[PDB]
Assembly symmetry: C4
Homo-oligomer: 389 residues x 4
């Protein structure tokens, strides 16, 4: 084994093929399946695994009552074999807490969890299954991180974190790790005005993080990171195709260097994009208002062109079904000439959209790029809420 | 580890001994057992595994309701240790979809799943647990495959696929894979008029696939494949002993080169045969109308002689019990000078034949050849439907 | 790895220490635990495992109804990590059937299961997890074997099998296996008049099997096997201390060469003994009539002296609790200069003795020798039958 | 690959970070989770595991009724992957009994369990999964041991055991093991007047065991062990900060060489401390009467200074929540220059404090030292007792 180096370009992508689906809510109606939210996937030289924040209870259990609540001492980052649903029997605890990221550097896995009260949270950084570093809150307001995978290059794994208000200017930092140890800490610089829940991927020696501006923008901030120099720049996705939720109608032109505001009633959702000239794809909920549906839009030069619009689309989840967070990952250890973009959509079931149940949970679907023009259908959660009533 | 070569002849078979039985429906009455159908077994250097298409629900779960339906976004190919029943806790997801095949080449396992809507399905081809190739539907009508194992020789694994009507001429192809990559594609040639759900095995450098003509024939198509030249020929099993379901009474003579028009009310069922001159064995349901019972018939020269009839028989499942699909596999890595034929029978329970329950599932029984003359009994599913009422 | 040989002597035993207990019935009252009976343990270079014949249903499942019945197509030999209870999720299917034995030769494990109808049963012999040999019934009346571990010496593993009446003269054979292949078959020789369910162990290059005479004797047959010459002799335990169930009161003298009759209402139970001159121990149920209680008695020269009586005792299961079958095993791979005797007791719950439930199952306790004088208590099953009503 | 040597010093500790939490009671309200008590953690070269004494029943099972009872034939030491909750499906049985210790010497794991009746208990000492040695009771009154990990140096692992009354003078021994074999036995010497349930850790070639005086002292006894010379001394923690439960108010001065008595109604609880001059931390329940709350107190020179008081505190469990036993462990195989203190708190639920249920069980939280000043949260058992009514 050797350190992963981000030497390869992104693969050409013309459509998206099915990678995995865990059907967790369908199965968890009867089997012992943990309540989760904030899922993702991350790979290593041996393959890929699903990750999520457990609520420390099963879905049918009486303790599922109240799991709309985001932060508790009963949450933990868990991982499991891709495709399986998360049970108490097949899940690995990565760290304890209510916000996370994880990535493999080619040698071992780094996992990070924040826990604690809102005014006094702390991150614990784990490497190869052991705790290495702890980081106290710097702003006394919910120190928190990506909720999808980090990316490593020559053993250096940058991680984006935020501490401060969700609805105003906050203190975002990029922390550069190696074997779980802090190499360098940078304050956020550039034109992004607020940063949450970054979705990051690497290609051609550059890491790109596509994030959530919870304060103003319905356009997504983009942080571009040089993992060798350990420096970064930031701005917004230039395209007029707005990809946060809630958002207004797409304007005539986007804005590379400032938020495009508007939309109702919610300030943001975790999301992602792959940005590679003509080979650029933006995910978004189909609804401009709610976390419903999910579509992939091929928008050439989305990163640079304020007039860029879609040239193709693929519906991943139809607009009659619930979605949620979405994020980027790549199997960097695949036997391929290029790094092939993948993504997941979190399929939220229960509260607040479905208030006939006392709980909130999700299932997962994941897809990767194809150079072919593949047919598509909706990969919605598939559980019947009435069965849980 | 090296590539498997089909260098051995088939073992002499006089009797069939019990290999495995999972008793999934009996166990699943109380334990967390996934709803399945279209099962099979496939082996590798280390041992043998059971495979099936999950319905993404447990048997006692409320989502078992409606599982008569063949195609949904909640289906997946799953595999598990031979003999165990399939639960959410002991199963590996091989790929996502509603039609599959899988085989080990001696180095790693190739698995293929079709998914998507009827008019726009796609295959994803996996190797060593990673996605390698995607294949779009070529005829826009349920792109689909074997529902039992493929077979490999010197790294080349041919797979039979069909796209188009189930009740008319369709577009069948033989696709030759190596490490999940397409080496060659041939259109079906020869005298077989319709091809579904091929059951395939190898011996003496030749692969034979015994299939289901869903259009006209109650006699089964036979495809003979040279995996070195990557060429094939096709025709029908010659024997008067007709092996599809439904079928009419066995005629005075079979027909090597044309379908013999069937019985009532089913157009076909997946089945298999081992064809080796005198050492030839044909499986079929005992009922000529329906998926009930299962028998093995030794029919010397079934492949070449229209007058060939049985010289011995073994009842596998009595005709008072439900059967289903059946298929071939071989433990190619056994410590034996010959390749010993094995088969499974899918034991279907619930709908449509048992409509007092809302679900359709199955269990599995598997047997392999013996040179001895062994006694037999019926290996029926064994669950009491009344318990599920 | 190397083939095990049996050159070492038996360790001195002055009392018995607890090795394992699975509490299967206690746990299975509310967890998914398989119905079993006929358990045992067997070891290999890595450790020891528990074995039993599953009934192919959970204990709380509706299919547990009727599990008094000994033989069905839904039974299989399952193994699992010592001390765990047997669930559908942690058990390995060794083979399919309703009578078994198993042993490790130092290189791989051999497992044998009989299945089929009473008049036409057959054994399948597995080695290293693959089927090797099949053996048809020779007398047409429930071909059957030890229900505890066999024993191997320099690759040769003898197994005692019986085919014929349970209540009169039957056809017993010793079959000598190597790598699952038949080396030699011998008809039973000597003065034992009937043989069932042998409990076997090795020491000093010799295998002793202590069996059950179901026809006449309340004293136990003893078969002495030389695994190098592949020959055997047979007689009865000489001691006046009678160890089958049912049995009469112990007489003033035993009989080395004929069955001692008497006892009511049961013709026999599987049991065991370790016979090593002054270092000899006999197990038996505490009740003379019924399968209740269990005691270990140190009976110097039990194998050779008709007047031999106990010089020490250890109650293993008190006489207010149900026992069942018992048998011998040894960890032949321990880091010791001698082979230390171990045994298990099957703790039967449910029918026929506990008729308030519809099922029959068991749990397991296992103990090994100590040279120390250890205190003792009763290791009964521990479940409350009322909880299952 | 090598025997652990206790060469490294203790790391500097300024606050405590979360390591693991299993949330067993919350999860076990619906999933199949074993009833336990007396938990701990122990690590090896590969990772850390949770340990506890099972009660041989699940929490929702009818057999959970009466599990306040400490000693039965149905208890066993089980271990499982750190962070998971203990189920019948993911737990390894280490040994059978109702008092235990375990530790890894760098090569293999030693586990010890006591079992049997009060007047005649015995220990069985296991090494690398096999039984090695048995020790009969020397005082005929509940032979018993640490209930948390032992510590090894150059293959020698000392273990503190007690036999005799809980409420008067008893017979304590230190037994030095290597590969599970007794190297030396010492009678307790020094000023400690009664010893129970030692919590032990090593640093700089010295092992320090912080114990429970159940006879007199509310201050904790401290046994100091030289694992090379295999010798020891004993006394009490000097600090006026009393750390047993029940205890009186902290006096003006502690006493290094004799018990500080008082407190009501209970004579003791298992506890721990790390003692390293200025770098010294004492755990205790927040309540001086009952097993509620848990606090860590930095008490410089607690081991040597009768006037030493706290200079910092961290609430681990709030005083509105139930706690229980606590103990020391260290990941001796961490990639760090110093050994980092860790500890766990047992979070007892059910009887006798919560008598609305018929059972007694626990969950686990574990924390390790940080050199940082981290914020803190209460890590209580998050279950709602009403859900179990
Ligand atoms: C314990 O298990 C054993 C295995 O050792 C099992 O063996 C089986 O026994 C039966 C006979 O009992 C064998 O049955 C034979 O099967 C063939 C083929 O049958 C299929 O096809 C025919 C035609 O379509 C169907 O009617 C039939 O239902 C099957 O689907 C038949 O051709 C055989 O018929 C001949 O033998 C009969 C006597 O056995 C005659 O009565 C009959 O007239 C036929 O005779 C002619 O051929 C004989 C040569 O086989 C010859 O001896 C005669 O002189 C004459 O020319 C027959 O029905 C079956 O193959 C065996 N299976 C295996 C795997 O070995 C035992 O029966 C069972 N024992 C028990 C229960 O105690
Ligand atoms: C039985 O097995 C033992 C243990 O493997 C063999 O012991 C070896 O004996 C030879 C002398 O015959 C010594 O040189 C070796 O050092 C021994 N090996 C060990 C690891 O103890 C023994 O040879 C075997 N006996 C037979 C006849 O097979
Ligand atoms: C069915 C159920 O348990 N409902 C509970 C309710 O009683 C409680 O008031 C609420 C807040 O804790 O949580 C929910
Ligand atoms: C392919 C590439 O970029 N070269 C790198 C090299 O610079 C680096 O020192 C090493 C360790 O990460 O991995 C390789
Ligand atoms: C029969 C059918 O397919 N549709 C029913 C629908 O009418 C009903 O409202 C619902 C709740 O029971 O179940 C479904
Ligand atoms: C077991 C075996 O012979 N495997 C062979 C491999 O060694 C060889 O490179 C190849 C070409 O024949 O086919 C395969
Ligand atoms: C018992 C049960 O769940 N039955 C349901 C029925 O209510 C529903 O109408 C149908 C299709 O949705 O699926 C089935
Ligand atoms: C107190 C008591 O029961 N005495 C027992 C004795 O009977 C027994 O022989 C010995 C070893 O088993 O342990 C002691
Ligand atoms: C309702 C019930 O179980 N009755 C029991 C009774 O038989 C027993 O004597 C007592 C002691 O445990 O507890 C109560
Ligand atoms: C660092 C380590 O674990 N290795 C040591 C080795 O250097 C030393 O010779 C021995 C002393 O007995 O103990 C072991
Ligand atoms: C609900 C339940 O099982 N309660 C039982 C009670 O009947 C019995 O008296 C006691 C002692 O055995 O154990 C408890
Ligand atoms: C704002 C706040 O609560 N800060 C607290 C601080 O008082 C304490 O030193 C620490 C450890 O418990 O937790 C943090
Ligand atoms: C148990 O099985 C017997 C025999 O089939 C049947 O009479 C009875 O109804 C069954 N009882 C239950 C409760 O399933
Ligand atoms: O409704 C789903 C989605 O499909 C695509 C577009 O054609 C729109 O109709 C819509 O945004
Ligand atoms: O001889 C009648 C018998 O012969 C053979 C088979 O074709 C059977 O289906 C048929 O019943
Ligand atoms: O092939 C099985 C077949 O064999 C012959 C007859 O005994 C039939 O009744 C039976 O169904
Ligand atoms: O009573 C004498 C006593 O001796 C010994 C055994 O044979 C016992 O069964 C018997 O009770
Ligand atoms: O061996 C057990 C046996 O030992 C003696 C007596 O104490 C008996 O009552 C008891 O049954
Ligand atoms: O200030 C009083 C305070 O001092 C310190 C400890 O002894 C505490 O138990 C006590 O409450
Ligand atoms: O260490 C816990 C302790 O810390 C300080 C005070 O707030 C106390 O009331 C509290 O009990
Ligand atoms: Ca926004
Ligand atoms: Ca047909
Ligand atoms: Ca008898
Ligand atoms: Ca005390």
């Amino acid at each position: 084994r050797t350190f992963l180096n981000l030497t390869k370009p992104l693969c050409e992508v013309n459509s998206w093929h099915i990678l995995s689906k865990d059907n967790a809510i369908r199965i968890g109606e009867d089997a012992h399946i943990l309540v989760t939210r904030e899922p993702y996937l991350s790979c290593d030289p041996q393959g890929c695994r699903m990750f999520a924040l457990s609520q420390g209870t099963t879905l049918r259990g009486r303790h599922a009552n109240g799991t709309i609540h985001d932060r508790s001492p009963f949450r933990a980052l868990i991982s499991w074999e891709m495709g399986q649903a998360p049970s108490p029997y097949n899940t690995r605890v990565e760290c304890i807490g209510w916000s996370s990221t994880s990535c493999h550097d080619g040698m071992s896995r780094m996992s990070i969890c924040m826990s604690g009260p809102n005014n006094n949270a702390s991150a614990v950084v784990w490497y190869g299954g052991r705790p290495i570093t702890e980081i106290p809150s710097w702003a006394g307001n919910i120190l928190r991180t990506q909720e999808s995978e980090c990316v490593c290059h020559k053993g250096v794994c940058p991680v984006v974190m935020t501490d401060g208000p969700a609805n105003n200017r906050a203190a975002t930092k990029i922390i550069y790790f190696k074997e779980g140890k802090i190499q360098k800490i940078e304050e956020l610089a550039g034109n992004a005005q607020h940063i949450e829940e970054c979705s990051c991927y690497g290609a051609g020696g550059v890491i790109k993080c596509i994030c959530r501006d919870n304060w103003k923008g319905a356009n997504r901030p983009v942080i571009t990171i040089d993992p060798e120099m350990m420096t970064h720049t930031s701005k917004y996705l230039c395209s007029k195709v707005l990809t946060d939720t809630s958002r207004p109608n797409d304007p005539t032109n986007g804005n590379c260097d400032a938020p495009i505001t508007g939309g109702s009633p919610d300030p943001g959702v975790k999301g992602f994009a792959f940005l590679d000239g003509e080979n650029s794809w933006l995910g978004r909920t189909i609804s401009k208002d709610s976390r419903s549906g999910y579509e992939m839009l091929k928008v050439p030069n989305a990163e640079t062109d304020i007039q860029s619009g879609p040239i193709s689309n693929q519906v991943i989840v139809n607009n009659q079904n619930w979605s949620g967070y979405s994020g980027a990952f790549i199997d960097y250890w695949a036997n391929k000439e290029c790094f092939n973009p993948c993504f997941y959509v979190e399929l939220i079931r229960g509260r607040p959209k479905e208030s006939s149940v006392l709980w909130t949970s999700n299932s997962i679907v994941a897809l990767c790029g194809s150079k072919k023009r593949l047919g598509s259908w909706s990969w919605h959660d598939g559980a019947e809420i009435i069965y849980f009533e």
